[PDB]
Amino acid sequence: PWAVKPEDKAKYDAIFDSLSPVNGFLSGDKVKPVLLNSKLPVDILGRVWELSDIDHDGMLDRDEFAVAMFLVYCALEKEPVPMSLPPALVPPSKR
Ligand SMILES: [Ca+2]
């Protein structure tokens, strides 16, 4: 299934709407700070975001911002983040 779970997409959809979503999008100006509070370096926010910004336009939609929350929260516990968007974390819209 999708690397993100329904319980994770629920906290991701709250964190996504905790930055002020725009018609279903968030500007790096909101997620950026939301990627730093993770205590991670800008390298993770540079890779995680990349694998999170399905569109890669400096913004994260509710589904793209979701991929950036579990990709970050995993770097705080112990799971680092690669730079290759895996097909298990990507939605059927990237197919
Ligand atoms: Ca986007």
From Swiss-Prot:
Residues modified to Phosphoserine: 20
Subcellular location as annotated: Cytoplasm; Cell membrane; Membrane, Clathrin-coated pit
Residues bound to Ca(2+) 1: 53, 55, 57, 59, 64
Post-translational modification, as annotated: Not required for membrane translocation after EGF treatment or for targeting to coated pits, but essential for a subsequent step in EGFR endocytosis. Phosphorylated on serine upon DNA damage, probably by ATM or ATR. Ubiquitinated.
Residue intervals of the EH domain: 8-95
Biological role stated in the UniProt entry: Involved in cell growth regulation. May be involved in the regulation of mitogenic signals and control of cell proliferation. Involved in the internalization of ligand-inducible receptors of the receptor tyrosine kinase (RTK) type, in particular EGFR. Plays a role in the assembly of clathrin-coated pits (CCPs). Acts as a clathrin adapter required for post-Golgi trafficking. Seems to be involved in CCPs maturation including invagination or budding.
Entry's disease: A chromosomal aberration involving EPS15 is found in acute leukemias. Translocation t(1;11)(p32;q23) with KMT2A/MLL1. The result is a rogue activator protein.
Protein known as: Epidermal growth factor receptor substrate 15
Organism encoding this protein: Homo sapiens (Human)
Gene that this polypeptide is encoded by: EPS15
Portion of the parent chain present: 121 to 215 of 896
